[PDB]
Amino acid sequence: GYTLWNDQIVKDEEVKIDKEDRGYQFGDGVYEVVKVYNGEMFTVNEHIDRLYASAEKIRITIPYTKDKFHQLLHELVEKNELNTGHIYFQVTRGTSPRAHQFPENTVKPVIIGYTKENPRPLENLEKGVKATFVEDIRWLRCDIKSLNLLGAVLAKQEAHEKGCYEAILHRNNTVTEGSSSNVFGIKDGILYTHPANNMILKGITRDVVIACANEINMPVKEIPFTTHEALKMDELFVTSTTSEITPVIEIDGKLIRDGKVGEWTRKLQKQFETKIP
């Protein structure tokens, strides 16, 4: 297939990374994942805006402008003939002799973007999944979608080893987000979720779900809940570009209510479907 390398579209086999790329020695870079539906990129405007925002947050000046980035992403999908799956793209500070501080003389940021055929998680959306609680031991700037993902790797692995789809992270019993998703709780027709500060990534799917709730007039309270409160919620689910609205029916053997997908989770999924390309 074809990969976006910097501002070029090249054959997969041509791409090689320098050992001194700061993304390889420091994880000094940011990234995005965009879902594609029948050749249509879902909320690509929001994902590109966040890529540039994450970049600005760690002072990386992406070498070309947004308009040029969208154009390159558009041809990447067409070149790979991607129907349904996702586009992954990242940008690092660039390659230069190893040193912690920013390169004295502005080097050019490295860009990588590729595609992958992958259907929607229909079985999970319908049936729900099992989750597990895992202590959030990550850094304090979770609002930046950076390449420093070692914490999430170890957490995801733990969940998979227990046959769970996701690891629900918590800071001293307070639920923050999932290893690669945002977490939502429902009690008495009210939608709860951790506020969007430095403790979580302000997900694009999270924002679309909150928009859906406002459209159907469901009360939304952006305040955190503990692991114990989460266990006594009427409904529970996780959100991500690839997971959409995935219901959580069980946490560590403990059923969320009756272990069935809830009413509001269904209403929310229904409204989310109206947004799909």
* Rounded-to-10 torsion of CA 21, 26, 29, 35: 100
Least Å distance, CB 229 to a copy of itself, is: 23
Report helix, strand or coil for 22: helix
* Catalytic sites, residue numbers: 145
Q: Is residue 138 a known part of a binding site?
A: no
Q: Is 74 annotated as a binding residue?
A: no
How many of the chain's residues bind a copy of itself (CB under 8 A)? 48
Can residue 180 be called a binding residue for a copy of itself (CB under 8 A)? yes
- Of 235 and 244, nearer to ligand PDD (C-beta) is 244
Q: Checking DSSP bridges between strand 29-37 and strand 166-171, what pairing results, if any?
A: unpaired
Q: Rule CB under 6 A: is residue 193 a binding residue for ligand PDD? A: no
Task: Give me the least distance between CB of 155 and a copy of itself, in Å please.
Answer: 8
Rounded Cα distance between 32 and 29, Å, is 11
Binding residues for a copy of itself restricted to 140-169, rule: CB under 8 A: 140-141, 146-157, 159-160
DSSP 181: B
Distance CA 19, CA 28 (A): 13
SS3 for 90-130 is EEECCECCCCCCCCCCCCCCCEEEEEEECCCCHHHHHHCEE
Cβ closer to a copy of itself: 113 or 185?
113
Residue 173 to residue 176: CA distance in whole angstroms: 9
Q: What part of residues 187-226 is at the interface with a copy of itself (CB under 8 A)?
A: none
Contacts with a copy of itself, 23-42, as mask; x by CB under 8 A: xxxxxx--x-----------
Which residues define the annotated binding site for substrate? 31, 98, 100
Note the residues at the interface with ligand PDD (CB under 6 A). 33, 152, 177, 180-182, 201, 203-206, 239-242
